DNA sequence: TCACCTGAACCGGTTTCTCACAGC
DNA sequence: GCTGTGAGAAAC
RNA sequence: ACUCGCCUCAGAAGAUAGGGAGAGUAACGGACGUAAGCGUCAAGACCACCAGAGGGUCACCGUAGAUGAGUAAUCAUCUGCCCAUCUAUAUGGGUGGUUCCCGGUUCAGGUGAA
Protein backbone atom coordinates (compact mmCIF):
# COMPACT_ATOMS: atom_id res chain seq x y z
CA UNK A 1 0.00 0.00 0.00
CA UNK A 2 3.01 2.14 -0.29
CA UNK A 3 3.52 4.82 -3.18
CA UNK A 4 5.84 7.25 -4.59
CA UNK A 5 5.21 10.90 -6.06
CA UNK A 6 7.98 11.94 -7.75
CA UNK A 7 8.29 16.02 -9.17
CA UNK A 8 10.80 17.54 -10.59
CA UNK A 9 12.12 20.79 -8.55
CA UNK A 10 13.00 23.87 -9.87
CA UNK A 11 15.43 25.42 -6.90
CA UNK A 12 16.67 28.62 -6.92
CA UNK A 13 20.68 29.48 -6.59
CA UNK A 14 21.23 29.62 -2.71
CA UNK A 15 19.28 25.92 -2.55
CA UNK A 16 21.44 24.07 -5.37
CA UNK A 17 24.42 25.56 -3.19
CA UNK A 18 22.98 23.54 -0.54
CA UNK A 19 22.13 20.64 -2.58
CA UNK A 20 25.30 20.24 -3.70
CA UNK A 21 27.14 20.22 -0.20
CA UNK A 22 24.29 17.48 1.04
CA UNK A 23 25.09 15.38 -1.95
CA UNK A 24 28.93 15.96 -0.93
CA UNK A 25 28.93 15.41 2.55
CA UNK A 26 26.51 11.88 2.26
CA UNK A 27 29.68 11.25 -0.20
CA UNK A 28 32.34 11.89 2.23
CA UNK A 29 30.57 10.00 5.04
CA UNK A 30 29.87 6.83 2.60
CA UNK A 31 34.03 7.16 1.91
CA UNK A 32 34.06 7.38 4.96
CA UNK A 33 32.71 4.05 6.39
CA UNK A 34 33.50 1.69 2.95
CA UNK A 35 37.16 2.53 3.90
CA UNK A 36 36.92 1.66 7.27
CA UNK A 37 35.00 -1.63 6.61
CA UNK A 38 37.54 -2.52 3.63
CA UNK A 39 40.24 -1.88 5.98
CA UNK A 40 38.72 -4.48 8.82
CA UNK A 41 37.82 -6.97 6.20
CA UNK A 42 41.30 -7.44 4.69
CA UNK A 43 42.81 -7.82 8.28
CA UNK A 44 39.96 -10.23 8.84
CA UNK A 45 40.95 -12.71 5.72
CA UNK A 46 44.62 -11.96 5.94
CA UNK A 47 44.03 -13.63 9.55
CA UNK A 48 41.61 -16.44 8.07
CA UNK A 49 44.23 -17.40 5.39
CA UNK A 50 47.09 -17.65 7.93
CA UNK A 51 45.45 -19.49 10.16
CA UNK A 52 43.90 -21.99 7.72
CA UNK A 53 47.56 -22.99 5.96
CA UNK A 54 47.69 -24.67 9.22
CA UNK A 55 44.87 -26.74 8.81
CA UNK A 56 42.44 -24.94 11.21
CA UNK A 57 38.86 -25.77 11.18
CA UNK A 58 36.52 -22.65 10.98
CA UNK A 59 34.22 -23.85 13.58
CA UNK A 60 36.46 -24.54 16.26
CA UNK A 61 37.90 -20.62 15.74
CA UNK A 62 34.44 -19.31 15.57
CA UNK A 63 34.36 -18.77 19.35
CA UNK A 64 37.83 -17.63 19.05
CA UNK A 65 37.11 -14.68 16.71
CA UNK A 66 34.07 -14.08 19.18
CA UNK A 67 36.30 -13.46 22.21
CA UNK A 68 38.34 -11.87 19.70
CA UNK A 69 35.87 -9.59 19.43
CA UNK A 70 35.67 -8.52 22.68
CA UNK A 71 39.27 -8.07 22.87
CA UNK A 72 40.46 -6.08 19.75
CA UNK A 73 38.94 -3.38 18.80
CA UNK A 74 40.42 -4.03 15.17
CA UNK A 75 38.56 -7.29 14.56
CA UNK A 76 34.82 -6.17 14.62
CA UNK A 77 32.36 -4.36 12.04
CA UNK A 78 30.23 -1.87 12.25
CA UNK A 79 26.50 -0.18 11.81
CA UNK A 80 25.19 3.16 10.52
CA UNK A 81 24.81 3.96 13.89
CA UNK A 82 28.40 2.97 16.22
CA UNK A 83 30.31 4.56 13.29
CA UNK A 84 28.60 7.52 13.84
CA UNK A 85 29.03 7.38 17.88
CA UNK A 86 32.61 6.33 18.11
CA UNK A 87 34.12 7.84 15.03
CA UNK A 88 31.77 10.78 13.30
CA UNK A 89 31.94 13.00 16.43
CA UNK A 90 35.23 12.86 17.32
CA UNK A 91 36.15 14.79 14.06
CA UNK A 92 33.14 16.46 14.18
CA UNK A 93 34.52 18.20 17.32
CA UNK A 94 38.15 18.09 15.70
CA UNK A 95 36.57 20.52 13.15
CA UNK A 96 35.00 22.46 15.48
CA UNK A 97 38.26 22.54 17.03
CA UNK A 98 39.86 24.01 14.20
CA UNK A 99 37.52 26.60 13.48
CA UNK A 100 37.46 27.97 16.44
CA UNK A 101 41.47 28.03 16.82
CA UNK A 102 41.68 29.55 13.52
CA UNK A 103 40.18 33.19 13.93
CA UNK A 104 42.49 33.87 17.31
CA UNK A 105 45.45 34.14 15.09
CA UNK A 106 47.79 31.17 14.11
CA UNK A 107 48.72 29.67 11.06
CA UNK A 108 45.68 27.90 8.91
CA UNK A 109 48.36 25.58 7.11
CA UNK A 110 49.46 23.55 10.30
CA UNK A 111 46.14 23.51 11.87
CA UNK A 112 44.37 22.09 8.72
CA UNK A 113 47.16 20.67 6.18
CA UNK A 114 45.77 19.81 2.64
CA UNK A 115 47.99 16.78 2.44
CA UNK A 116 46.52 14.53 4.80
CA UNK A 117 42.75 16.05 4.49
CA UNK A 118 41.30 17.17 0.86
CA UNK A 119 39.02 20.20 2.56
CA UNK A 120 40.02 23.62 2.04
CA UNK A 121 38.47 24.38 5.82
CA UNK A 122 36.30 22.48 8.60
CA UNK A 123 33.13 21.29 8.07
CA UNK A 124 31.94 17.74 9.45
CA UNK A 125 29.20 19.47 12.24
CA UNK A 126 27.99 22.37 9.85
CA UNK A 127 25.83 20.24 7.83
CA UNK A 128 22.77 18.94 8.77
CA UNK A 129 22.30 15.53 10.66
CA UNK A 130 20.28 13.27 8.81
CA UNK A 131 22.02 14.19 5.63
CA UNK A 132 25.08 12.83 7.35
CA UNK A 133 23.33 9.13 8.36
CA UNK A 134 22.30 9.36 5.08
CA UNK A 135 25.59 8.21 3.94
CA UNK A 136 26.38 5.40 6.85
CA UNK A 137 22.53 4.54 6.03
CA UNK A 138 23.58 3.83 2.35
CA UNK A 139 27.04 2.46 2.99
CA UNK A 140 25.57 -0.21 5.80
CA UNK A 141 23.18 -0.80 3.01
CA UNK A 142 26.01 -1.67 0.55
CA UNK A 143 27.91 -4.05 3.05
CA UNK A 144 24.86 -5.94 4.23
CA UNK A 145 24.13 -6.27 0.41
CA UNK A 146 27.48 -8.05 -0.13
CA UNK A 147 27.72 -10.18 2.87
CA UNK A 148 24.42 -11.31 2.25
CA UNK A 149 25.23 -11.69 -1.82
CA UNK A 150 28.70 -13.88 0.02
CA UNK A 151 27.00 -16.15 2.61
CA UNK A 152 23.35 -17.71 1.89
CA UNK A 153 20.88 -15.34 1.33
CA UNK A 154 20.99 -12.86 -1.84
CA UNK A 155 19.58 -15.59 -4.86
CA UNK A 156 21.32 -14.59 -7.75
CA UNK A 157 24.77 -13.63 -9.64
CA UNK A 158 27.61 -12.74 -6.80
CA UNK A 159 27.34 -9.24 -5.77
CA UNK A 160 30.68 -7.75 -6.18
CA UNK A 161 32.06 -6.38 -3.17
CA UNK A 162 31.91 -2.87 -2.21
CA UNK A 163 32.90 0.42 -4.35
CA UNK A 164 34.39 3.51 -3.98
CA UNK A 165 32.26 6.60 -4.65
CA UNK A 166 33.29 9.00 -7.11
CA UNK A 167 32.11 12.68 -8.22
CA UNK A 168 30.48 12.57 -11.59
CA UNK A 169 30.96 8.56 -11.37
CA UNK A 170 28.19 7.83 -9.22
CA UNK A 171 24.32 9.27 -8.23
CA UNK A 172 23.66 11.92 -6.25
CA UNK A 173 21.26 11.44 -3.52
CA UNK A 174 19.85 10.96 -0.05
CA UNK A 175 16.48 10.64 1.96
CA UNK A 176 15.17 12.11 5.12
CA UNK A 177 12.69 10.76 7.33
CA UNK A 178 9.80 11.69 9.34
CA UNK A 179 9.34 13.79 11.75
CA UNK A 180 10.68 16.42 10.81
CA UNK A 181 9.06 19.09 9.03
CA UNK A 182 7.41 18.19 5.60
CA UNK A 183 4.40 18.37 3.31
CA UNK A 184 3.07 19.44 0.45
CA UNK A 185 -0.34 22.67 0.70
CA UNK A 186 -1.26 23.38 3.81
CA UNK A 187 2.17 22.86 5.37
CA UNK A 188 3.88 26.48 7.67
CA UNK A 189 6.84 27.85 6.44
CA UNK A 190 10.10 27.72 8.36
CA UNK A 191 11.39 30.72 10.41
CA UNK A 192 14.09 33.08 9.55
CA UNK A 193 14.22 32.18 5.39
CA UNK A 194 14.23 34.61 3.10
CA UNK A 195 10.14 33.73 2.15
CA UNK A 196 9.16 34.47 5.73
CA UNK A 197 10.88 37.72 6.09
CA UNK A 198 8.11 38.30 3.78
CA UNK A 199 5.35 37.51 5.86
CA UNK A 200 4.14 34.09 4.46
CA UNK A 201 3.16 31.88 7.45
CA UNK A 202 1.37 28.54 5.08
CA UNK A 203 1.53 27.18 2.02
CA UNK A 204 -1.50 28.55 -0.27
CA UNK A 205 -1.20 26.78 -4.01
CA UNK A 206 -0.45 23.93 -5.08
CA UNK A 207 3.32 24.44 -6.39
CA UNK A 208 5.16 24.61 -3.32
CA UNK A 209 7.29 21.76 -0.85
CA UNK A 210 7.95 21.30 2.19
CA UNK A 211 11.84 19.67 2.64
CA UNK A 212 13.06 20.16 6.04
CA UNK A 213 16.08 22.99 6.74
CA UNK A 214 16.09 23.43 3.06
CA UNK A 215 12.80 25.69 3.33
CA UNK A 216 9.97 25.19 0.75
CA UNK A 217 10.80 24.64 -2.95
CA UNK A 218 8.96 25.16 -5.90
CA UNK A 219 8.22 21.91 -8.36
CA UNK A 220 6.94 21.66 -12.23
CA UNK A 221 4.09 19.00 -11.34
CA UNK A 222 0.81 19.93 -9.43
CA UNK A 223 0.64 18.75 -5.78
CA UNK A 224 -3.10 18.20 -5.92
CA UNK A 225 -3.18 14.66 -6.25
CA UNK A 226 -0.59 14.47 -3.59
CA UNK A 227 -3.00 16.64 -1.39
CA UNK A 228 -6.17 15.04 -2.00
CA UNK A 229 -4.60 11.88 -2.04
CA UNK A 230 -3.17 13.28 1.90
CA UNK A 231 -6.35 14.13 2.69
CA UNK A 232 -7.92 10.50 2.63
CA UNK A 233 -6.25 8.75 5.45
CA UNK A 234 -2.12 9.28 3.98
CA UNK A 235 0.33 10.49 5.64
CA UNK A 236 3.63 11.36 3.87
CA UNK A 237 6.39 9.02 5.51
CA UNK A 238 9.80 10.71 3.91
CA UNK A 239 11.47 12.18 0.91
CA UNK A 240 14.35 11.77 -1.09
CA UNK A 241 16.25 13.87 -3.26
CA UNK A 242 18.23 12.21 -6.49
CA UNK A 243 20.42 13.76 -9.43
CA UNK A 244 20.16 13.59 -13.22
CA UNK A 245 22.45 15.56 -15.38
CA UNK A 246 21.77 18.86 -13.98
CA UNK A 247 18.04 18.37 -12.53
CA UNK A 248 17.21 17.65 -9.51
CA UNK A 249 13.85 15.31 -8.54
CA UNK A 250 12.49 14.76 -4.84
CA UNK A 251 10.53 11.92 -3.87
CA UNK A 252 8.07 11.83 -1.95
CA UNK A 253 7.14 8.38 -0.06
CA UNK A 254 3.24 7.90 0.74
CA UNK A 255 1.74 5.44 2.85
CA UNK A 256 -1.93 4.91 2.05
CA UNK A 257 -4.22 3.27 5.15
C1' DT B 1 35.51 10.20 -17.23
C1' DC B 2 30.53 11.21 -17.54
C1' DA B 3 26.24 8.92 -19.00
C1' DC B 4 23.03 5.87 -20.32
C1' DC B 5 20.33 1.52 -20.07
C1' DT B 6 19.30 -4.00 -18.58
C1' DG B 7 19.21 -6.91 -14.96
C1' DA B 8 18.73 -9.60 -10.30
C1' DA B 9 17.40 -9.02 -5.82
C1' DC B 10 14.97 -6.96 -1.94
C1' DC B 11 12.64 -3.10 0.17
C1' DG B 12 9.86 1.84 1.69
C1' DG B 13 13.69 5.31 10.16
C1' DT B 14 12.17 6.39 16.22
C1' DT B 15 13.12 9.10 20.41
C1' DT B 16 14.95 12.45 23.98
C1' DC B 17 16.66 16.41 25.18
C1' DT B 18 18.06 21.30 24.86
C1' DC B 19 17.15 25.90 23.46
C1' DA B 20 16.04 30.18 21.28
C1' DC B 21 12.23 31.99 20.39
C1' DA B 22 8.47 36.56 17.63
C1' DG B 23 5.89 38.83 19.16
C1' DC B 24 3.85 40.82 21.74
C1' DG C 1 10.49 40.86 28.81
C1' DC C 2 9.45 36.21 28.99
C1' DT C 3 7.92 31.81 27.26
C1' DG C 4 4.94 26.83 24.53
C1' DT C 5 6.47 26.28 19.50
C1' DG C 6 9.38 25.11 16.53
C1' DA C 7 14.12 23.56 15.02
C1' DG C 8 17.69 20.83 15.54
C1' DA C 9 21.61 17.88 17.64
C1' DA C 10 22.75 13.32 19.34
C1' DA C 11 22.26 8.50 20.41
C1' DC C 12 20.53 4.14 18.50
C1' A D 1 7.59 35.36 -50.18
C1' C D 2 5.22 30.13 -48.58
C1' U D 3 5.92 24.22 -46.92
C1' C D 4 9.42 20.20 -44.19
C1' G D 5 13.45 19.76 -39.07
C1' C D 6 18.06 19.30 -36.56
C1' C D 7 19.38 20.69 -31.27
C1' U D 8 16.86 23.97 -27.05
C1' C D 9 12.70 26.06 -22.57
C1' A D 10 7.79 24.10 -21.23
C1' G D 11 7.51 16.83 -15.44
C1' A D 12 6.52 12.47 -19.98
C1' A D 13 3.09 11.65 -24.99
C1' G D 14 -0.60 15.53 -27.82
C1' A D 15 -1.19 21.94 -28.16
C1' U D 16 2.41 27.02 -28.17
C1' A D 17 7.96 30.39 -28.15
C1' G D 18 13.33 30.55 -28.75
C1' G D 19 19.94 30.47 -32.55
C1' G D 20 20.38 29.21 -36.80
C1' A D 21 19.18 26.09 -41.15
C1' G D 22 17.84 24.41 -45.29
C1' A D 23 14.58 23.24 -51.00
C1' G D 24 11.64 24.59 -54.40
C1' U D 25 8.25 27.58 -57.02
C1' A D 26 9.66 16.31 -48.57
C1' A D 27 14.92 14.68 -48.03
C1' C D 28 18.92 16.97 -45.98
C1' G D 29 21.64 19.02 -40.79
C1' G D 30 22.38 21.89 -34.35
C1' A D 31 25.16 27.09 -33.79
C1' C D 32 29.59 31.00 -32.06
C1' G D 33 33.90 31.05 -31.99
C1' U D 34 38.63 29.82 -29.94
C1' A D 35 41.40 17.11 -36.05
C1' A D 36 39.70 18.35 -32.21
C1' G D 37 38.56 19.58 -27.71
C1' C D 38 36.94 23.21 -24.12
C1' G D 39 34.23 27.45 -23.02
C1' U D 40 29.50 30.42 -24.46
C1' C D 41 24.23 31.51 -26.12
C1' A D 42 19.39 30.24 -27.57
C1' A D 43 10.87 30.33 -23.22
C1' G D 44 7.23 35.40 -22.53
C1' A D 45 4.21 38.85 -18.01
C1' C D 46 4.70 41.52 -12.78
C1' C D 47 7.32 44.12 -8.32
C1' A D 48 12.12 45.26 -6.58
C1' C D 49 18.78 46.54 -6.50
C1' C D 50 22.30 49.78 -9.00
C1' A D 51 22.40 48.03 -19.23
C1' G D 52 22.77 43.73 -16.30
C1' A D 53 22.74 40.68 -11.97
C1' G D 54 19.40 38.26 -7.98
C1' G D 55 14.08 37.12 -5.94
C1' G D 56 8.25 35.61 -6.49
C1' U D 57 3.96 33.82 -10.58
C1' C D 58 2.46 30.94 -14.82
C1' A D 59 3.81 28.07 -19.71
C1' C D 60 -2.19 21.68 -16.62
C1' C D 61 -7.31 22.56 -15.09
C1' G D 62 -14.52 24.27 -20.30
C1' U D 63 -18.28 28.55 -19.93
C1' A D 64 -20.79 32.31 -15.96
C1' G D 65 -20.80 34.82 -11.09
C1' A D 66 -19.42 35.87 -5.28
C1' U D 67 -16.18 35.88 -1.51
C1' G D 68 -11.40 36.08 0.34
C1' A D 69 -4.89 36.21 0.22
C1' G D 70 -1.56 39.15 -2.60
C1' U D 71 1.02 46.66 -3.78
C1' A D 72 0.58 42.99 -8.44
C1' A D 73 0.86 38.33 -11.57
C1' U D 74 -1.71 34.71 -10.30
C1' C D 75 -3.92 31.49 -7.08
C1' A D 76 -7.66 29.32 -3.64
C1' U D 77 -12.68 28.26 -1.88
C1' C D 78 -18.32 27.95 -2.78
C1' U D 79 -22.83 28.50 -6.18
C1' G D 80 -24.45 28.10 -11.07
C1' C D 81 -24.81 25.84 -16.55
C1' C D 82 -22.86 22.27 -20.50
C1' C D 83 -20.17 18.00 -21.67
C1' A D 84 -17.90 13.45 -20.69
C1' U D 85 -17.82 9.71 -17.10
C1' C D 86 -19.53 5.97 -14.15
C1' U D 87 -22.94 3.97 -10.17
C1' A D 88 -28.14 0.64 -7.85
C1' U D 89 -33.57 -0.37 -8.40
C1' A D 90 -37.40 6.55 -16.66
C1' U D 91 -34.98 7.42 -12.47
C1' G D 92 -31.56 9.12 -8.56
C1' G D 93 -26.81 10.19 -7.11
C1' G D 94 -20.86 11.08 -7.66
C1' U D 95 -16.53 12.21 -10.62
C1' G D 96 -13.96 15.38 -13.32
C1' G D 97 -13.01 19.21 -17.62
C1' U D 98 -6.81 17.49 -23.98
C1' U D 99 -4.22 11.01 -21.54
C1' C D 100 -0.21 8.44 -18.16
C1' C D 101 3.14 8.20 -14.17
C1' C D 102 5.96 3.42 -7.91
C1' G D 103 9.96 4.34 -6.65
C1' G D 104 14.44 3.31 -3.90
C1' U D 105 19.30 1.71 -2.85
C1' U D 106 24.03 -1.53 -4.74
C1' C D 107 26.70 -4.61 -7.51
C1' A D 108 27.73 -6.33 -12.85
C1' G D 109 27.46 -6.17 -17.78
C1' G D 110 26.61 -3.72 -22.65
C1' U D 111 27.22 0.30 -25.81
C1' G D 112 28.04 5.46 -26.16
C1' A D 113 30.21 10.15 -27.18
C1' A D 114 34.59 11.99 -25.21
Redo the contacts with the bound molecule.
Keep these: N ?7 L ?1 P ?3 QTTALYQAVGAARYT ?1 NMLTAYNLEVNRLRDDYWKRRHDEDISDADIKKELNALAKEDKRYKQLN ?2 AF ?2 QY ?2 PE ?1 KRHEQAEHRIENGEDPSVVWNQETERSANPWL ?1 T ?4 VL ?1 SG ?3 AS ?2 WD ?2 WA ?1 RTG ?19 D ?3 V ?5 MGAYGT ?5 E ?2 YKQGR ?1 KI ?5 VRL ?2 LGTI ?1 T ?3 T ?2 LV ?1 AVVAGAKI ?2 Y ?1 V ?1 R ?3 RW ?1 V ?1 F ?1 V ?1 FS
Design positions: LRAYKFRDNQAYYGGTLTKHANQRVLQNDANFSKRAGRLVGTPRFKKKGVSRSFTPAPEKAYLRGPARTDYRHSYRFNSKPKRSTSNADYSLK
